[PDB]
Amino acid sequence: PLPKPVLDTNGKELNPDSSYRIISIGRGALGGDVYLGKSPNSDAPCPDGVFRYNSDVGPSGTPVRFIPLSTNIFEDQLLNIQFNIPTVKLCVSYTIWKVGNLNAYFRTMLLETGGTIGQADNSYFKIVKSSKIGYNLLSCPFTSIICLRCPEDQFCAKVGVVIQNGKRRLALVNKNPLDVLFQEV
Amino acid sequence: PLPKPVLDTNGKELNPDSSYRIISIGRGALGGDVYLGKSPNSDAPCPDGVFRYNSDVGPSGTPVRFIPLSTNIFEDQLLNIQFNIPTVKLCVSYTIWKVGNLNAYFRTMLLETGGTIGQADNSYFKIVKSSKIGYNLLSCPFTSIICLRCPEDQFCAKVGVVIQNGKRRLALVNKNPLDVLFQEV
Asked: Which burial class, exposed, middle or buried, applies to B27 when counting CB atoms under 10 A from its CB (0-12, 13-18, 19+)?
């Protein structure tokens, strides 16, 4: 086997020194880029939610960068994701992606910022080829805990969307993973 | 294959209508029964921690009962665990076992009460034969989420102990599962 690089929308392999919008395969009303927004029921002083827009006809996404376990961004390998945008004084820490605590109402964990880099917590993801069209994000929370008889003793789950206050909120799901592409800025 | 019943300390199969102390295989200073205690850094109005004592020479455990997906308590099957003791007005809800949010300092989830019965949340456990001597408790949090390519798409982990304020606190661990027996009251 060989580590397979993840490609952007233009075919050029993904680069840690570059920034990408996470854009959806689906089009129009079925479309909308990932971005940083405010969770209605969050107490954080900063915007701390990972959302995708309701249509692709409007604002573009918030750019992100990917931080592999060194040194190349490959498929099926743990990495961190971080919004790459300038930030107020208070919010410099609310930029690294992470998966949150169990939410009883959605029965899943929601995607948020406030994570950390290079640590065996809830900030690790994977990029993998979708079953349908393109790429899926995977969340691998709890890398410090042995998942008994799991692929590499690791709990991983697909990233999809739930509706929270009539917005699309990225979260762990079972079916209908968000199919995405990475359009370099 | 056949469902194998879990046995108590006397050989009689485990009964949902009965109560058991969870006692350790280890003896003396290496011993101590599971019980309900107060978490130092918890804000709950009630005692909400699952601990084992520091020696078996002293107080006995807090009795628990087991609530299978009906109708018999078998090995390797989801169930709920609940302290069976009389309770103040406020604390009637803080009695069902559950696994808590990720604790950054211990890099694991701790065992607490305040869970619910029969719901696909963080209140499910399993009893299984230990690798060494006797029984292990397993925690299967997030039964609502597909663990990709995991045994029955389910994240499960072993239950052990961490030291919190010089007490033994039950929590998800990788090595050294708490080996236990069930001594009927």
From this structure: exposed
